Design a protein around this ligand. Sequence first.
Ligand SMILES: CCCCCCCCCCCCCCNC(=O)N[C@H](CC(=O)[O-])C[N+](C)(C)C
Length: 623
Amino acid sequence: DDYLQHSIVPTMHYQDSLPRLPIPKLEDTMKRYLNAQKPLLDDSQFRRTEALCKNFETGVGKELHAHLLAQDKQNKHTSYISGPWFDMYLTARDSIVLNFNPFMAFNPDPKSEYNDQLTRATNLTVSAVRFLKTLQAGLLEPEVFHLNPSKSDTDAFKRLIRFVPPSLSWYGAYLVNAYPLDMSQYFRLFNSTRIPRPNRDELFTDTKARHLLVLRKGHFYVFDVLDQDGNIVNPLEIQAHLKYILSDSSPVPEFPVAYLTSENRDVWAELRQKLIFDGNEETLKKVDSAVFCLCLDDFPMKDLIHLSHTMLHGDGTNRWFDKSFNLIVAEDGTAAVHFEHSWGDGVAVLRFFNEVFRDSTQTPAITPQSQPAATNSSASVETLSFNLSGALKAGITAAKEKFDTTVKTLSIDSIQFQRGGKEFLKKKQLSPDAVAQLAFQMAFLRQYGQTVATYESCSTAAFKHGRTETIRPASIFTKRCSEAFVRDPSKHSVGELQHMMAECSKYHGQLTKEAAMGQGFDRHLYALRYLATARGLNLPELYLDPAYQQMNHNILSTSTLNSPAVSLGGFAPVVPDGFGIAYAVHDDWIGCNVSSYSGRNAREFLHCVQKCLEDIFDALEGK
Ligand SMILES: CCCCCCCCCCCCCCNC(=O)N[C@H](CC(=O)[O-])C[N+](C)(C)C
């Protein structure tokens, strides 16, 4: 068949009974806000801020809340944050490249021969299309967070929950300590893209389109991956259609149209609507509706940094960044997924990324031998064609240039801490995640001598339309403990260090649990900002306060994911003077992939994270 999973529970079965993302009560949010400020502000700054939190709490804030609560009661079908969060993304007129689009890189196939470009591109293309198919058939297994997997992730429970109506189904998984997740982002995984428009950019989806977009050397191609019936095209045809694209020797155009998608969003809004007026709507549509986009780079990876630059921005000529995502397969068969962020938060992407890796490696659709089907590529494979006015050649060349400027400012490097990872730390009764967040803080203070506003991403996906809440790793405990380890490593005794690390580990876990539960502060205060501005009042004075802006100016921005399908991943820093830390804590090692601009140094900040981790373990080993 053409499904890569065969679930008896329909994929969307729990969507109707997901609980609502709770709104915290306001007193808490302010406490939580001020707790987060405590390690960063000095004395008088803290005083100032607190005065404001009092004003806001019983003044304007109290009234915004009254209203955010009543509006939420009137909109039970959704979460109170979704709309204002989609807008966070869509209204940002900055480039999406670096500022929003991240990557994650696949591991190779274990079987050497299968890492050939033609083979691999074909199989990945085919699994992806298999996945779409199975999603559509409702035969993908619902996303669930299991506390007791050997209890609830069993045919036995599935065989049973399946008869429970969607309007009550979430309670059956609840009573077994299992947590179904929101899965609405998934309808935008395929045949979908971001359209630049003035003010709010807009998300486009077309469900009928049966075709793959492929970018080689700047040239646009399309061909069919799904036939008249809705069945996957013959692997060996697809293989042939790709082989024949891999042949074409026309070099890189004087105007690769793929630069317009890295521009400022108003510049590109307008240029896009000029391409329209100059007669390209129809060809834009062909680009806009493609299930996804397959980028076939024609160079090999020299190393990890190279791979990272390549997967994160590339050269500019060879990625439609507006697309829901991009499947990149290079010459040594290194592959990845680079994705636009407005439509989704990448639990979905990890799910897709995971199914696709499994299926393509354990169930290749073709083999490094397979003889390509006899067929007429030139008639099946369309080569796209644009009408490029003077003004549009002008804007393509301006996009090339603004692109290449920025890309020279970025510098990424990595570490592979091999003295142990998750095992050892869980033995010492410590949250492995916090130990890592601890290495960061400590590494920074060891190198720049400050304590800066830190962002950790956490999922609120167990609620309806749930997205992310923010963990605030930089706490009073993390400050004290970091001072201890760095200024006066000798004024404190061994067990005395061990105690502080437990303080951190502890407080951290209280945040991680509250975050996931809707119970942090950032989304709340933001949802309150949005509603002022939206009813047309002035900004309230809490958000004007310098300290508020400083809190939301994340010098360290961090994110992690565990999968045996991922080799590494990455994202730009989120501010001009900041860090992009992608990290993963494995059984026996800790990996980081760190990005920075000109005002900061990565390689060096990684030498500190190494040492910070060495001292961490030694302290834990009673040295
Ligand atoms: C060699 C060492 C191995 C490194 C492995 C790193 C593991 C992969 C982690 C990279 C994940 C990148 C995509 C996930 N995106 C994501 O979390 N976006 C965040 C979304 C949000 O917080 O709302 C934004 N941000 C990155 C700024 C925190």
